[PDB]
Swiss-Prot record, chain A:
It is found in: Nucleus. The chain holds residues 250 to 279 of 281 of the full protein. It comes from Saccharomyces cerevisiae (strain ATCC 204508 / S288c) (Baker's yeast). Induction: Translation is induced by amino acid or purine starvation, or during growth in low or poor carbon sources. Translational repression during nutrient-rich conditions is dependent on four uORFs (upstream open reading frames) present in the 5'-UTR of the mRNA; these promote ribosome dissociation. Translational induction occurs in conditions reducing translation machinery efficiency, leading to ribosomes scanning over the uORFs, and increased translation of the mRNA. The rapid translational induction is followed by transcriptional induction at later time-points, independently of the uORF sequences. Belongs to the bZIP family. GCN4 subfamily. Phosphorylated by the cyclin-CDK PCL5-PHO85. This is General control transcription factor GCN4.
């Protein structure tokens, strides 16, 4: 029952790559949320200064 | 034998849910990228108006 064996190895590889992609995107989300925090701080500085 | 069938079922199922998660994350990324673009243009404009900074 090989066709089954090839399918399983094919699926284990896809699973490994999907786990990789999930890890990559989580990091990109953390990094972007950190970026948002820093920009929000810069804008707050400007707005506060512009306000008076 | 039937174990192979069970493993095939398990993997197709785990992969389906990982794909769903990948799609969710990519939407969140796209959303954060758009929030960043709006913030960037606001900051770039203040730099220009107040500091004489062009990109």
């Amino acid at each position: 029952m090989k066709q089954l064996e090839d399918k399983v190895e094919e699926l284990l590889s896809k699973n490994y790559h999907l786990e990789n992609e999930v890890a990559r995107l989580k990091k990109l989300v953390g990094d972007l949320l950190n970026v948002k925090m820093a920009l929000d701080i810069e804008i707050a500085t400007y707005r506060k200064l512009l306000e008076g």
